[PDB]
Write a protein of this length. Structure first.
Length: 98
């Protein structure tokens, strides 16, 4: 009934960044039993919102070749901070099977 669809999303940073926040990581789980990195908020007017594709609850899988599989929150954050203007996100979207 539930699955994941993997999508590639390219964002261009605005002056206020990509326009989203994250939670999760090994030792700082967003969801019980699950170490993945999740999008927790999408800022109105921000790059991610305007682009239209990223959604709250989506899993961040990779950023510019850097894996976010089984990373700490701090490793994730450093990856997100390390970015310049153009950012390629590999995203896992929760999906319902009909």
């Amino acid at each position: 009934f539930q699955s994941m669809t993997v999508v590639e999303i390219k964002l261009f940073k605005g002056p206020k960044g990509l326009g989203f926040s994250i939670a999760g990581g090994v030792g700082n789980q967003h969801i019980p039993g699950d170490n993945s990195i999740y999008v927790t908020k999408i800022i109105d007017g921000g790059a991610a919102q305007k682009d239209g594709r990223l959604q709250v609850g989506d899993r961040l899988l990779m950023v510019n070749n850097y894996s976010l599989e089984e990373v700490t929150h701090e490793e994730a954050v450093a990856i997100l901070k390390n970015t310049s203007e153009v950012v390629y996100l590999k995203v896992g979207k929760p999906t319902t099977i009909y």
